Design a protein around this ligand. Structure first.
Ligand code: FMN
Ligand code: MG
Ligand code: MG
Ligand code: MG
Ligand code: MG
Ligand code: MG
Length: 171
């Protein structure tokens, strides 16, 4: 089986969304991974409605975490996700590197390169990528970033390319 080929027991796809698009993209990435690995062991999880302590201050051995995250320059629920990661990083009550037992992680960022070019472009996905590594999760693939101001056809090939690249790194 292909899941065992990537030394994983299952794949968790976390996302956050305000306008709904990242949720659709997460569903599409999930369906692509189900087909490629011919597995049903792929979960999609909305970061706003799960207990973050259950997934990011402790981790099921050999799980892959994919994190799909838009960035918002305004206050949003994504701020809470990032704050929760940092709190776990600094909290003496939690041992260091609690996610070292995972297979690993990879982050795919979505953002608006036309209005937020520069420091703000996919800045929260950048932060999430930095913080997951500090929690001890092995970075399986380098951070991906998608400019959603491209034509929608280009947005989908960008995320499908990233998904296929992740699966090759995961081998
Ligand atoms: C109010 C607002 C602020 C945004 N700020 C950023 C930003 O700081 N950096 C970035 O890359 N994209 C930014 N964007 C673009 C969004 O991240 C992008 O539209 C994303 O696809 C939204 O995802 P969603 O539909 O799942 O909520 C912003 C969009 C809005 C509406
Ligand atoms: Mg959300
Ligand atoms: Mg998006
Ligand atoms: Mg925000
Ligand atoms: Mg982003
Ligand atoms: Mg990454």
């Amino acid at each position: 089986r292909k899941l065992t080929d990537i030394s994983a027991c299952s794949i968790n796809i976390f996302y956050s969304t305000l306008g709904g698009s990242t949720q659709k993209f997460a569903e599409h990435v999930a369906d692509r991974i189900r087909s490629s690995l011919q597995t049903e062991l792929v979960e999609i999880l909305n970061l706003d409605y799960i207990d973050l302590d259950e997934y990011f201050s402790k981790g099921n051995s050999n799980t892959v975490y994919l994190v799909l995250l838009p960035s918002y320059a305004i206050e949003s629920s994504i701020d809470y996700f990032l704050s929760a990661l940092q709190t776990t990083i600094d909290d003496f009550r939690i041992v260091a590197r609690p996610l070292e037992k995972l297979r690993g992680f990879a982050v795919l960022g979505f953002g608006d390169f036309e209005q937020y070019a520069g420091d703000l472009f996919c800045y929260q996905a950048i932060a999430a990528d930095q913080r997951l590594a500090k929690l001890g999760a092995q970075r399986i693939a380098p951070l991906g970033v998608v400019n959603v101001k491209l034509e929608k056809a280009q947005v989908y090939e960008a995320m499908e390319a990233w998904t296929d690249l992740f699966l090759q790194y995961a081998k």
